[PDB]
Amino acid sequence: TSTPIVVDCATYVCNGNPRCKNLLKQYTSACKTIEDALRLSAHLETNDVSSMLTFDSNAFSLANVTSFGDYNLSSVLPQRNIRSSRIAGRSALEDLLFSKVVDVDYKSCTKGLSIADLACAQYYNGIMVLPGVADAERMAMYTGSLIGGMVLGGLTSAAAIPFSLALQARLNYVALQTDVLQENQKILAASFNKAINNIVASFSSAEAIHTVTIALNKIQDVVNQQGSALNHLTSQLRHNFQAISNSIQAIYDRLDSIQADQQVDRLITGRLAALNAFVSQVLNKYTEVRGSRRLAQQKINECVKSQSNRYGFCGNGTHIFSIVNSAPDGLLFLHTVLLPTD
Amino acid sequence: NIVASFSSAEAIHTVTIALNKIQDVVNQQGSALNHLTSQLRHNFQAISNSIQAIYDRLDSIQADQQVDRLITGRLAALNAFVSQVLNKYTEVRGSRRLAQQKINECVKSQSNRYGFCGNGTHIFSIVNSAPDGLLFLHTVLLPTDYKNVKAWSGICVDGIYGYVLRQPNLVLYSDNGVFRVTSRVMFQPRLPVLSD
Amino acid sequence: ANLSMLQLGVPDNSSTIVTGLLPTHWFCANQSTSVYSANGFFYIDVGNHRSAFALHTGYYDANQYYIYVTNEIGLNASVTLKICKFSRSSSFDCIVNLLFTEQLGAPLGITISGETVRLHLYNVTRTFYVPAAYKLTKLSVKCYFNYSCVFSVVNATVTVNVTTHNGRVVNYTVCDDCNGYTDNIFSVQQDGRIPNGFPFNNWFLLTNGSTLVDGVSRLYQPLRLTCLWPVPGLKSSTGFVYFNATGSDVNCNGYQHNSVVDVMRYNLNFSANSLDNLKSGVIVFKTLQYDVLFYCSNSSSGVLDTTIPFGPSSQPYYCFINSTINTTHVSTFVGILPPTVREIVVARTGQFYINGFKYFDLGFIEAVNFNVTTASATDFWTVAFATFVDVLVNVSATNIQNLLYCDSPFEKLQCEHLQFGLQDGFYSANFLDDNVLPETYVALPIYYQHTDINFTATASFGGSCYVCKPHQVNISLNGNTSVCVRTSHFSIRYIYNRVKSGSPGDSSWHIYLKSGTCPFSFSKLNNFQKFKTICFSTVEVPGSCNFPLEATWHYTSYTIVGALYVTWSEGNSITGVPYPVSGIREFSNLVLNNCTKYNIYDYVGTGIIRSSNQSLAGGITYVSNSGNLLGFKNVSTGNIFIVTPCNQPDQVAVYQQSIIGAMTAVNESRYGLQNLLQLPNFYYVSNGGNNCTTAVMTYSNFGICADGSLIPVRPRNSSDNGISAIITANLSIPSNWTTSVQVEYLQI
Amino acid sequence: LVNVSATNIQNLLYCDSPFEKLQCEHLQFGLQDGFYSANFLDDNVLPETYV
Ligand SMILES: *[C@@H]1O[C@H](CO)[C@@H](O[C@@H]2O[C@H](CO)[C@@H](O[C@@H]3O[C@H](CO[C@H]4O[C@H](CO)[C@@H](O)[C@H](O[C@H]5O[C@H](CO)[C@@H](O)[C@H](O)[C@@H]5O)[C@@H]4O)[C@@H](O)[C@H](O[C@H]4O[C@H](CO)[C@@H](O)[C@H](O)[C@@H]4O[C@H]4O[C@H](CO)[C@@H](O)[C@H](O)[C@@H]4O[C@H]4O[C@H](CO)[C@@H](O)[C@H](O)[C@@H]4O)[C@@H]3O)[C@H](O)[C@H]2NC(C)=O)[C@H](O)[C@H]1NC(C)=O
Ligand SMILES: *[C@@H]1O[C@H](CO)[C@@H](O[C@@H]2O[C@H](CO)[C@@H](O[C@@H]3O[C@H](CO[C@H]4O[C@H](CO)[C@@H](O)[C@H](O)[C@@H]4O)[C@@H](O)[C@H](O[C@H]4O[C@H](CO)[C@@H](O)[C@H](O)[C@@H]4O[C@H]4O[C@H](CO)[C@@H](O)[C@H](O)[C@@H]4O)[C@@H]3O)[C@H](O)[C@H]2NC(C)=O)[C@H](O)[C@H]1NC(C)=O
Ligand SMILES: *[C@@H]1O[C@H](CO)[C@@H](O[C@@H]2O[C@H](CO)[C@@H](O[C@@H]3O[C@H](CO[C@H]4O[C@H](CO)[C@@H](O)[C@H](O)[C@@H]4O)[C@@H](O)[C@H](O[C@H]4O[C@H](CO)[C@@H](O)[C@H](O)[C@@H]4O)[C@@H]3O)[C@H](O)[C@H]2NC(C)=O)[C@H](O)[C@H]1NC(C)=O
Ligand SMILES: *[C@@H]1O[C@H](CO)[C@@H](O[C@@H]2O[C@H](CO)[C@@H](O[C@@H]3O[C@H](CO)[C@@H](O)[C@H](O[C@H]4O[C@H](CO)[C@@H](O)[C@H](O)[C@@H]4O)[C@@H]3O)[C@H](O)[C@H]2NC(C)=O)[C@H](O)[C@H]1NC(C)=O
Ligand SMILES: *[C@@H]1O[C@H](CO)[C@@H](O[C@@H]2O[C@H](CO)[C@@H](O[C@@H]3O[C@H](CO[C@H]4O[C@H](CO)[C@@H](O)[C@H](O)[C@@H]4O)[C@@H](O)[C@H](O)[C@@H]3O)[C@H](O)[C@H]2NC(C)=O)[C@H](O)[C@H]1NC(C)=O
Ligand SMILES: *[C@@H]1O[C@H](CO)[C@@H](O[C@@H]2O[C@H](CO)[C@@H](O[C@@H]3O[C@H](CO)[C@@H](O)[C@H](O)[C@@H]3O)[C@H](O)[C@H]2NC(C)=O)[C@H](O)[C@H]1NC(C)=O
Ligand SMILES: *[C@@H]1O[C@H](CO)[C@@H](O[C@@H]2O[C@H](CO)[C@@H](O[C@@H]3O[C@H](CO)[C@@H](O)[C@H](O)[C@@H]3O)[C@H](O)[C@H]2NC(C)=O)[C@H](O)[C@H]1NC(C)=O
Ligand SMILES: *[C@@H]1O[C@H](CO)[C@@H](O[C@@H]2O[C@H](CO)[C@@H](O)[C@H](O)[C@H]2NC(C)=O)[C@H](O)[C@H]1NC(C)=O
Ligand SMILES: *[C@@H]1O[C@H](CO)[C@@H](O[C@@H]2O[C@H](CO)[C@@H](O)[C@H](O)[C@H]2NC(C)=O)[C@H](O)[C@H]1NC(C)=O
Ligand SMILES: *[C@@H]1O[C@H](CO)[C@@H](O[C@@H]2O[C@H](CO)[C@@H](O)[C@H](O)[C@H]2NC(C)=O)[C@H](O)[C@H]1NC(C)=O
Ligand SMILES: *[C@@H]1O[C@H](CO)[C@@H](O[C@@H]2O[C@H](CO)[C@@H](O)[C@H](O)[C@H]2NC(C)=O)[C@H](O)[C@H]1NC(C)=O
Ligand SMILES: *[C@@H]1O[C@H](CO)[C@@H](O[C@@H]2O[C@H](CO)[C@@H](O)[C@H](O)[C@H]2NC(C)=O)[C@H](O)[C@H]1NC(C)=O
Ligand SMILES: *[C@@H]1O[C@H](CO)[C@@H](O)[C@H](O)[C@H]1NC(C)=O
Ligand SMILES: *[C@@H]1O[C@H](CO)[C@@H](O)[C@H](O)[C@H]1NC(C)=O
Ligand SMILES: *[C@@H]1O[C@H](CO)[C@@H](O)[C@H](O)[C@H]1NC(C)=O
Ligand SMILES: *[C@@H]1O[C@H](CO)[C@@H](O)[C@H](O)[C@H]1NC(C)=O
Ligand SMILES: *[C@@H]1O[C@H](CO)[C@@H](O)[C@H](O)[C@H]1NC(C)=O
Numbered sequence A: 001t002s003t004p005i006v007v008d009c010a011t012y013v014c015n016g017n018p019r020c021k022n023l024l025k026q027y028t029s030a031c032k033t034i035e036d037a038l039r040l041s042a043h044l045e046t047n048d049v050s051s052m053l054t055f056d057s058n059a060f061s062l063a064n065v066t067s068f069g070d071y072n073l074s075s076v077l078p079q080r081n082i083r084s085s086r087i088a089g090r091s092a093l094e095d096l097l098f099s100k101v102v103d104v105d106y107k108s109c110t111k112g113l114s115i116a117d118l119a120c121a122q123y124y125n126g127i128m129v130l131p132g133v134a135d136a137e138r139m140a141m142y143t144g145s146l147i148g149g150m151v152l153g154g155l156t157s158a159a160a161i162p163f164s165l166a167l168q169a170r171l172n173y174v175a176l177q178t179d180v181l182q183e184n185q186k187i188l189a190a191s192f193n194k195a196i197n198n199i200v201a202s203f204s205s206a207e208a209i210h211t212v213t214i215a216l217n218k219i220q221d222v223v224n225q226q227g228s229a230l231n232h233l234t235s236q237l238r239h240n241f242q243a244i245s246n247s248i249q250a251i252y253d254r255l256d257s258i259q260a261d262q263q264v265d266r267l268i269t270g271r272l273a274a275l276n277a278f279v280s281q282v283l284n285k286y287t288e289v290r291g292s293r294r295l296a297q298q299k300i301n302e303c304v305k306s307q308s309n310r311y312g313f314c315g316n317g318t319h320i321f322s323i324v325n326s327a328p329d330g331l332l333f334l335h336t337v338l339l340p341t342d
Numbered sequence B: 001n002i003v004a005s006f007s008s009a010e011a012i013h014t015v016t017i018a019l020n021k022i023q024d025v026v027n028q029q030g031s032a033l034n035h036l037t038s039q040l041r042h043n044f045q046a047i048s049n050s051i052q053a054i055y056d057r058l059d060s061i062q063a064d065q066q067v068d069r070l071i072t073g074r075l076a077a078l079n080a081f082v083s084q085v086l087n088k089y090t091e092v093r094g095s096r097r098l099a100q101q102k103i104n105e106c107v108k109s110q111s112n113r114y115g116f117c118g119n120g121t122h123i124f125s126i127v128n129s130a131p132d133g134l135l136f137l138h139t140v141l142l143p144t145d146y147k148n149v150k151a152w153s154g155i156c157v158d159g160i161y162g163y164v165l166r167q168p169n170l171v172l173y174s175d176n177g178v179f180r181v182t183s184r185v186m187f188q189p190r191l192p193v194l195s196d
Numbered sequence C: 001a002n003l004s005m006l007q008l009g010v011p012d013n014s015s016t017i018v019t020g021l022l023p024t025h026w027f028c029a030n031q032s033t034s035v036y037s038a039n040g041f042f043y044i045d046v047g048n049h050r051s052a053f054a055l056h057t058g059y060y061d062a063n064q065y066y067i068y069v070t071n072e073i074g075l076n077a078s079v080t081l082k083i084c085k086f087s088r089s090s091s092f093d094c095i096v097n098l099l100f101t102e103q104l105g106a107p108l109g110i111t112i113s114g115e116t117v118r119l120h121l122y123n124v125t126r127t128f129y130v131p132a133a134y135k136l137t138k139l140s141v142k143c144y145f146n147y148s149c150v151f152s153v154v155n156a157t158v159t160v161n162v163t164t165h166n167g168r169v170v171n172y173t174v175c176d177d178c179n180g181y182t183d184n185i186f187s188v189q190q191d192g193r194i195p196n197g198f199p200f201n202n203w204f205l206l207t208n209g210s211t212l213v214d215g216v217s218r219l220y221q222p223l224r225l226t227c228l229w230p231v232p233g234l235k236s237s238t239g240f241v242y243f244n245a246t247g248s249d250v251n252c253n254g255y256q257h258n259s260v261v262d263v264m265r266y267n268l269n270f271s272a273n274s275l276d277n278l279k280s281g282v283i284v285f286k287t288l289q290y291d292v293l294f295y296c297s298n299s300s301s302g303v304l305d306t307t308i309p310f311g312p313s314s315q316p317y318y319c320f321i322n323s324t325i326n327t328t329h330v331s332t333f334v335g336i337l338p339p340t341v342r343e344i345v346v347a348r349t350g351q352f353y354i355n356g357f358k359y360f361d362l363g364f365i366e367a368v369n370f371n372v373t374t375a376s377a378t379d380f381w382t383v384a385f386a387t388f389v390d391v392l393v394n395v396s397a398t399n400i401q402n403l404l405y406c407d408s409p410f411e412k413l414q415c416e417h418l419q420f421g422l423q424d425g426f427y428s429a430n431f432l433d434d435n436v437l438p439e440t441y442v443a444l445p446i447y448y449q450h451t452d453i454n455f456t457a458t459a460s461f462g463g464s465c466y467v468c469k470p471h472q473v474n475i476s477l478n479g480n481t482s483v484c485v486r487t488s489h490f491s492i493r494y495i496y497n498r499v500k501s502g503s504p505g506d507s508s509w510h511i512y513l514k515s516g517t518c519p520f521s522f523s524k525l526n527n528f529q530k531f532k533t534i535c536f537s538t539v540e541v542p543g544s545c546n547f548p549l550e551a552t553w554h555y556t557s558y559t560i561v562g563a564l565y566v567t568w569s570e571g572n573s574i575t576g577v578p579y580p581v582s583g584i585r586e587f588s589n590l591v592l593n594n595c596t597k598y599n600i601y602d603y604v605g606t607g608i609i610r611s612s613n614q615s616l617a618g619g620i621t622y623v624s625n626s627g628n629l630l631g632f633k634n635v636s637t638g639n640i641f642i643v644t645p646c647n648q649p650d651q652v653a654v655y656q657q658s659i660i661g662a663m664t665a666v667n668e669s670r671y672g673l674q675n676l677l678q679l680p681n682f683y684y685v686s687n688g689g690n691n692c693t694t695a696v697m698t699y700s701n702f703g704i705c706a707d708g709s710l711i712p713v714r715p716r717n718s719s720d721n722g723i724s725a726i727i728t729a730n731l732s733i734p735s736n737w738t739t740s741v742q743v744e745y746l747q748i
Numbered sequence D: 001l002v003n004v005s006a007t008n009i010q011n012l013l014y015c016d017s018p019f020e021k022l023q024c025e026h027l028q029f030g031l032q033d034g035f036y037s038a039n040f041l042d043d044n045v046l047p048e049t050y051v
């Protein structure tokens, strides 16, 4: 996903000026279109994400750490409760990812009292940053459902199996096992536990460090871009066009309407052009993300729910299972694979 | 139900989505052209938006400057339009790649890619045309009722020799003492043989 | 028709003429099902039986909105309205789907004009805009007298005499008389509105220059009525009318508001016979000083006749103004009349218009005598007494087709988007509270030091004539030909000494500065404008831009008198001041707590300033990256001020062509909406309850339901089991299967 | 390169050295490690040619 942005046709051009309210009438068919594009895009994106984030209460309950035992899962599992009227909270890893890389509270932007923060300062120019879609409770519900599926083996009722068994089944898939005793499981549980600890430590601060670094770089990049786009849009308000000032009020304090309206029309033209450019940028980003969502869904189906044989896809090795967690604007996948040693 | 749903079951959800998407594609093509056309009215910093009106009032020594301003503006509008068009083509190319994969895997062959063509057991798909695209009708099986099965992990003859089914997709179970083998997917039981 | 006063649009305890799409005869029959030509219908039910009505076309059109009504009765009437496209009663595209609860015995109904659909719900009216509604000219009726249903098929152009008393309607009598009333006569509605559906037969839009021909726009026009006086009976014995409709004869039709208007509008009568159209007569205006006489003639020799043509001519008519000062019979040509004269409008301001076009401008008018000599009453259809309003108008061939007043929040949205009806969904809004603000002024330390200048003019007229020119004008700058500012501050006035005559015949002359050749307006040099140097002159100076001084006699003739010359260079040594500040050693001003205009260390804008106190180490100006003040520190001390934009933007939810609710940043009630919720990062204001079935509009994790209350979103429920393992166990294995077909669209 | 606050000098940077000149060119008191474009134009008086 990415955050929806809606920009007011008028406030971003003439920030509360009643003179422009008249001048802008002649651009209705060109100014309204800005809002139409932005609102539609927000709508479409909201619907799409909503169509992914489904929920299963059985698996959610079975996502309990006690289903996983020797393999741990505690830094992955959502907080079961925060003693509040909320189904779930963020896992330890999620708190880490979000905190390290880091919705506006618009109620504060009317109180005065403090020098305004950046958000309100953008709000004052008609640039609204909307609430998200993939909120924390939805993401946890979705995620917990995926995790419980790892232990809710194909039994009557909603009976679960030991995670040890689940994995054994996923091994037989690759190569039928001929040994009654699972010598492999203690080795793999221990190895797994180290791998997870290394990843969490790597994120907090093994070739896992390579892979983790890449994930962090990418997450940071996404964040920086959203900020940069808005800063550019906002900065352009200072770009006095071929006119006396960049303040419409300052123009009307100096010139009568017979000239002032021309000076202001130049500013209006410039500002509308800036908005058109912004909209194009936004639409392009949505297209990119749609591509990514398609891929993400494939990986959820093939590499989480089923278990594929697509060598070179989910994990450079023999894929046993994957864990999914939320991340800023996205999903983080932890692909657990086997690697031969001897 | 689908034809009726299109004319006006959870199929209604899926059909609604297809309709919304088809309509969206259509609206966008119209909107882009309307914008391009509307911009012709955006008189730039000149006397008029009609070149003729300019030449009826001013001699060439000034008229050519007024007109050059209009020309610059209009060329800029075209450049913007072209960029928009090219971006749309890129998007569609992505979609065509996917469409071809689905034709091959979900129409001609029949895949095992759970979660791909149809949320269920894919048997076959039908393809029809749609405005600017293809409509796929994926026919899948959905379980309705299942049996409770007394499964065994294997047989251990004389307390020494375990024997298990070679194929992991099969279940050995006790049909009230009669041992039978079934698929884990569909309840189509048969008697076991040693070669299993 | 047993209509309420509210349906009729009439005042209590009175007698009025009501015009338009009214009910008449009642089809009290048991024929079950029938079809009529119609522009609407009314019906009355009390009986416990279903009834239904529909307005439709003569064939099936897949893309026409059709109007369907159903009524069911219990204790009250359950009334359903649907305006939708139908699958040859299956709707699939709807403008409105509403349920009302109505008083039994009420006459309920629907009327259509153009694309406007009016729903009459006894006590109230609701309006919808429905594409091509005018096509719905067939009425189907399902209804019997056997079950109490009676109905009246509505045709067109009905005029009714209505009498009211003690809240009741007493009389409802259709005219056989009232010929032509439906094109010119109507009743003034509550608050002065002209009734929806009226045809503006001779009502022009006023202009000062160009005219609109076709399109939609917001106008400022004299379309709110305080009175309306039908076939007024104006005769040469009537005398003068003083704009405020408080004259002894002014029996206004409809509601009356005892105030003072901006204009009087005369809707003129005429025929095809030119000899019944040309009348002898004059129009006389009482100004603050003299009588002014307006009249016309066919030839240019105005001295040979005194007429007013109404209606179509066959020749040009020349029109002149006369006014006399101690036998100084000043007389001038003004202009040529249009081929047809239909409306005359006179403003208190002195502005005089014909068919919307301004012909001349008197200094001020106290009263008017439309002195047509006659034999009859039949020269006027009506006199309207009106004030200016902000209206959205659909203009066609220069005529009014659709007039929308924008007073309510929803009507204001229609105005803001210039659109007659919206699309259900979300809209941004910011209804700027346009008004006059106090001005604040904050600047770096400086001793205050100010000089006055006036640019004065004194004039004489009558050198050989009037209208032609001023005889002489004496122009000076504080008595000099050149005055300069050598002070930190200054201010400038403009004075026209008509008073020099002792007896201001000069009030017929208007002498003032024109927009100059300078990058500033003269009158704005008193705002906080900054220069290095200025100097002013009444005589030509090389390199100096100027402001021409122009004279006119009631804006007919125009001539240049002289000019004010100014030189300057940019910089910050000299500042203009709004008024002659005195006493103060160092000049500044600061207003807190409601909107101001400000100039603060050269940042200029508007908003609200509030005091605060934070440890803002550093400089004195705090701005956004868009260059707007966030705050400032008051130089001499550590007090800091916060600057905010009072006109905040909000999001409005629209459904069934009405405002449902709004998302805001401010903890207050809003667009009629009262019920305020606090949500983690905003407030939501509604008028809905907390029990409302389903969202109709959605975003994020919430939706807005049909009555505006909020509903939380919940993720789609779905689940399944895992994959069975090689374990001794009770497994669940599918036996019976069904099939479904899933639909996917891909663009190629 | 001057950091001005309430009209007063807060930070005065002379730009004589190449690195100080980069700070001047980007108007920034300290850079971010990485790559930068540079073209320190040798402003001076030139002879004029005429063809
Ligand atoms: C170029 O010139 C600049 C222009 O003047 C210069 O930037 C200015 O640098 C000074 C440093 O000298 C700023 O310092 C401020 O000091 C506050 C004052 O308290 C300190 O000083 C007193 C006097 O020196 C002492 O009495 C006091 O110490 C006592 O108390 C302590 C607390 O009780 C205790 O620990 C000590 O022992 C002692 O007893 C103390 O030392 C300080 O509050 C101030 O606030 C910032 O930090 C808070 C903590 O991080 C934030 O909470 C506040 O929220 C401040 O951060 C904001 O500003 C940063 C700088 O602009 C941004 O990075 C942040 O993002 C944040 O900005 C947001 O908020 C702004 C509104 O407040 C808004 O405008 C932004 O857009 C954004 O929203 C701070 O230390 C001084 O204010 C800087 N001044 C300005 C105007 O920026 C810059 O350094 C010079 N350039 C170069 C190259 O040097
Ligand atoms: C062609 O161009 C002329 C160009 O000037 C234009 O005429 C001008 O029209 C406006 C509108 O026709 C006239 O200006 C003033 O309008 C208000 C309008 O009411 C609105 O605003 C008040 C205040 O914001 C609200 O309360 C109200 O609800 C409305 O929303 C009138 O009320 C003003 O009338 C004043 O003068 C009367 C006579 O002097 C007084 O009885 C009345 O009390 C007013 O007093 C107020 O204004 C004085 C102004 O000097 C001030 O001293 C007093 O304290 C007090 O505040 C008023 O007329 C403007 O006057 C018009 N022009 C001329 C020459 O007079 C034409 O409309 C335009 N024509 C077309 C077709 O476009
Ligand atoms: C592919 O996508 C489909 C959609 O196309 C998903 O299939 C649905 O899966 C759910 C679970 O995944 C089905 O489960 C059934 O839900 C019914 C819904 O109950 C709610 O709604 C009713 C009606 O609105 C309310 O009264 C009730 O309180 C609920 O809020 C239940 O009603 C069903 O249980 C009943 O039937 C079973 C079977 O006969 C009995 O044991 C139960 O007692 C009870 O009587 C049940 O849970 C839903 O039917 C499925 N959809 C479809 C179209 O069949 C598929 O899962 C999905 N993915 C795959 C791979 O298949
Ligand atoms: C606008 O002005 C027209 C005048 O140009 C005016 O229409 C006329 O109204 C009267 C009043 O509304 C008509 O009625 C007449 O009344 C006298 C009454 O005694 C009769 O004698 C007239 O009889 C003549 O006309 C009959 C109808 O054509 C003939 O049958 C008979 O022989 C006579 O010739 C007549 O009824 C008069 O007809 C019309 N005038 C016209 C041109 O039709 C109109 O009402 C104005 N309206 C307003 C509100 O100003
Ligand atoms: C506006 O001001 C104008 C500025 O002067 C007015 O013009 C004047 O109008 C009067 C009538 O409009 C003229 O009358 C003159 O009368 C003499 C006298 O002879 C006439 O009377 C005898 C007796 O009634 C009769 O036998 C004769 O036939 C005449 O009818 C004539 O000899 C003149 O020829 C003339 O008609 C004024 O001279 C004239 N001004 C000018 C410049 O001519 C104008 O009336 C005013 N407009 C209005 C509507 O009041
Ligand atoms: C600008 O023009 C005015 C007129 O040419 C000249 O100043 C005027 O001075 C009088 C006396 O100082 C002001 O007060 C008036 O006093 C009389 C008598 O007590 C009283 O009836 C009037 O009400 C009024 O108070 C008058 O206000 C002032 N006029 C203005 C417009 O300020 C002024 O001198 C001029 N500027 C220069 C440089 O001369
Ligand atoms: C939005 O405005 C309403 C305006 O009524 C604010 O809610 C009100 O908050 C006061 C203060 O918390 C309530 O408490 C009252 O306090 C006085 C003083 O202690 C006491 O005399 C009264 O009995 C009462 O407790 C008041 O009940 C409450 N208003 C309502 C309708 O309940 C509200 O907080 C503002 N909301 C925000 C988020 O700013
Ligand atoms: C695993 O299940 C336990 C099952 O007992 C959860 O812990 C319980 O949480 C409820 C929450 O309302 C408390 O009343 C119980 O007392 C808690 N259990 C214990 C043992 O104290 C635990 O949170 C679940 N863990 C996970 C990861 O979901
Ligand atoms: C313009 O100024 C002249 C000069 O001040 C005025 O005419 C003077 O009037 C007095 C009084 O009648 C005479 O004593 C002077 O001789 C006249 N001067 C001249 C040069 O003839 C003139 O009246 C003023 N004009 C206006 C329009 O105010
Ligand atoms: C109209 O007459 C008044 C007298 O009826 C004129 O004003 C007077 O003119 C005389 C000398 O011509 C002065 O003494 C008076 O003091 C004037 N009146 C006032 C109030 O000062 C007036 O000028 C004549 N007006 C004209 C022809 O325009
Ligand atoms: C999914 O199934 C649950 C399980 O029965 C629904 O039941 C409750 O619905 C109300 C109102 O919809 C919620 O407040 C309760 O929290 C839900 N119950 C439980 C146990 O969670 C829920 O409606 C269903 N549908 C959806 C979309 O969540
Ligand atoms: C193979 O042997 C292990 C030992 O017989 C069995 O797994 C045991 O399952 C019970 C189930 O309640 C657990 O308590 C034991 O702790 C498991 N024990 C051990 C040692 O793992 C396993 O079930 C056997 N059967 C299969 C199908 O693997
Ligand atoms: C009729 O409308 C008035 C407002 O004009 C309102 O006060 C009254 O309660 C309404 N009455 C009914 C019965 O709806
Ligand atoms: C409506 O007009 C037809 C002529 O158009 C007429 O027959 C009918 O009776 C009129 N309606 C009513 C209510 O009388
Ligand atoms: C309306 O009734 C009053 C009372 O009957 C009468 O004065 C008036 O002339 C009537 N008007 C019409 C059009 O009949
Ligand atoms: C210039 O104005 C002063 C104004 O008070 C006046 O005394 C002076 O005589 C005027 N200058 C000339 C040259 O007349
Ligand atoms: C609002 O402004 C008027 C002046 O415009 C002043 O009387 C009033 O106190 C103001 N303040 C507030 C908060 O209402």
Ligand SMILES: *[C@@H]1O[C@H](CO)[C@@H](O)[C@H](O)[C@H]1NC(C)=O
Binding pocket: C611, C612, C613, C614
């Ligand atoms: C100062 O800041 C406090 C900070 O907690 C605020 O409550 C107070 O109103 C401020 N304003 C002033 C002018 O004291």
